[PDB]
Design a protein around this ligand. Sequence first.
Ligand SMILES: *C/C=C(C)/C=C/C=C(C)/C=C/C1=C(C)CCCC1(C)C
Length: 227
Amino acid sequence: TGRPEWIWLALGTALMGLGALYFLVKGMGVSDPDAKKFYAITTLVPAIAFTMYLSMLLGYGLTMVPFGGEQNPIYWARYADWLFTTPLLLLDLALLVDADQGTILALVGADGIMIGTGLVGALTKVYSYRFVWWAISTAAMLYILYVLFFGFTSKAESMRPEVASTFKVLRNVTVVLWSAYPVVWLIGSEGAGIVPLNIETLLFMVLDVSAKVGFGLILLRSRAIFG
Ligand SMILES: *C/C=C(C)/C=C/C=C(C)/C=C/C1=C(C)CCCC1(C)C
């Protein structure tokens, strides 16, 4: 096939794999129970991303959805990735500030809605309705971000500055990166079709890698993960 976006898919696969292995190696050397916890969660994130990037690289996770008078290429494998990686990242943040079970449940649920409606919208055949689903998915993301900024930050204040400071950074990277996804979707292949798929794939790999390996590197190198 040789689609123009394959190089970005290859680069995404490469970076997710390397990040996974490094986390795995670093994770199985640590003896601390809590640290192990964070390591297992944070290693799984890029591990899942790797498998999906690899699949997409190999020609799977791609479907032609008709709308706008065109046969649009929609990479659905992405949602198969995010469905499990986004809530896991959320869990990492939750465990960090000792969030309550109710909060976590609500965050993971909002996250499920976000990815769920997101895919439904990415698959919808009525052009205008694609944006209705997109709209609901974004509303869910804003809820998650609101909670992370207003809820979590507040509880991270019962933690040690080292932990509060680590969370702030992770929270910040998350707010900035996550905020970008809906915009990429809106102007890319799933939306307005303004930004071409190859470029679109590039933007997604940068955000994905930053949000997983970037996030992991920051979290795992901190002393805040220790019991
Ligand atoms: C490793 C992957 C990460 C951190 C992915 C984050 C993804 C989002 C915040 C995605 C958000 C979306 C919307 C707000 C609406 C349209 C569809 C999505 C799923 C692209």
